[PDB]
């Protein structure tokens, strides 16, 4: 089973992030899941579509 029920493409600035978890395909979920743990303790799922998240993965070699 996947962790995300919804996904947002909105830009989350560095100042509001605690951690970004990247979950690839498999382990119960067919899609790639990008989970953002915010400083305000809320957990936000981000669309692997968003340009800002694409630019980040592109550099995370």
């Amino acid at each position, epitope marked *: 089973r996947c962790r995300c029920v919804q996904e947002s493409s909105v*830009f989350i*600035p*560095r*100042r509001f*992030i*605690d*951690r*970004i*978890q*990247i979950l690839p395909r498999g382990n119960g979920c067919p899609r790639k899941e990008i*989970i953002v*743990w915010k*400083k305000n303790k809320s957990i936000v799922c981000v669309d692997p579509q968003a340009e*800002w998240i694409q*630019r*980040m993965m592109e*550099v*995370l070699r």
Partner: antibody, heavy 127, light 111 residues
Framework: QVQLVQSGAEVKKPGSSVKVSCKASGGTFSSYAISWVRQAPGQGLEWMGGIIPIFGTANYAQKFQGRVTITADESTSTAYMELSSLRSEDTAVYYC????????????????????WGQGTTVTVSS | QSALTQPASVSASPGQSITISCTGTSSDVGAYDWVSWYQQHPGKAPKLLIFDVNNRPSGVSHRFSGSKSGNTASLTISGLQAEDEADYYCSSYTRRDTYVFGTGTKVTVLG
């Protein structure tokens, strides 16, 4: 050799502008943020502003809004700091500094600190 | 301008342990663990000693330690030696999304 190489010493007249360069050597700007900090002779460290080159997002300290423009070219890993309307108080050493990340199997963790500092740039204002 | 409060000077004999306080407000130091410490030698660039209240980057000696209680953060230098004779600055991020530095502390080793 994983460092931030800054442009040379500058001597400027009061009222003129100064553009300081900060090039990453032995690394890239990556997902890191780059901040600009200054230090007047015999005085303390003062955060001017910062930029996240990967998104082009820039923030400035209240005191420096309108006087300072901070830019970055991610393709060459070079960051710039332009300070206008120079005066006696602007005579200082200008440093660029990296705000790094921490990564595990648990994820990406941003670090609000300056781990890599440039050698500094001396900017002298004549009068 | 709205700098964090640090004692101007802290001194002790060689081999002693010293503590440097850094007082801010609920908006900065008091708001989160985004508090770091810097060592600066005369005519040199600052160096990161501590990040995230008490974390040490690679190369920084176990002699340097950090802690935070309320609106006050602290740096502890144990086994004080002549190489520790420098200026010390605390830093914090703010809810006004800026960084703010402490006024600085000159650490002297007494003879």
């Amino acid at each position: 050799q994983v460092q931030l190489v800054q442009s040379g010493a500058e001597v400027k007249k009061p009222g003129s502008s100064v553009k300081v360069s900060c090039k990453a050597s032995g690394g890239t700007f990556s997902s890191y943020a780059i901040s600009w900090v200054r230090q007047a002779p015999g005085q303390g460290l003062e955060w001017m502003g910062g930029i996240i080159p990967i998104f082009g997002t820039a923030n400035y300290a209240q005191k420096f809004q309108g006087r300072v423009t901070i830019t970055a070219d991610e393709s060459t890993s070079t960051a710039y700091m332009e300070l206008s309307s120079l005066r006696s108080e602007d005579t200082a050493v200008y440093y660029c500094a990296r705000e790094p990340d921490y990564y595990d199997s648990s994820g990406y963790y941003p670090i609000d600190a300056f781990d890599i500092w440039g050698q500094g740039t001396t900017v002298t204002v004549s009068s | 301008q709205s700098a964090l409060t640090q004692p101007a000077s802290v001194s002790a004999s060689p081999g002693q342990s010293i503590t440097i306080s850094c007082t801010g407000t609920s908006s900065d130091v008091g708001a989160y663990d985004w508090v770091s410490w810097y060592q600066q030698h005369p005519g040199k660039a600052p160096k990161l000693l501590i990040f995230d209240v008490n974390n040490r980057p690679s190369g920084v000696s176990h002699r340097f330690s950090g802690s935070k209680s309320g609106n006050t953060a602290s740096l502890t230098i144990s086994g004080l030696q002549a190489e520790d004779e420098a200026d010390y600055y605390c830093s914090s991020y703010t809810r006004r999304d800026t960084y703010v530095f402490g006024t600085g502390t000159k650490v002297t080793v007494l003879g």
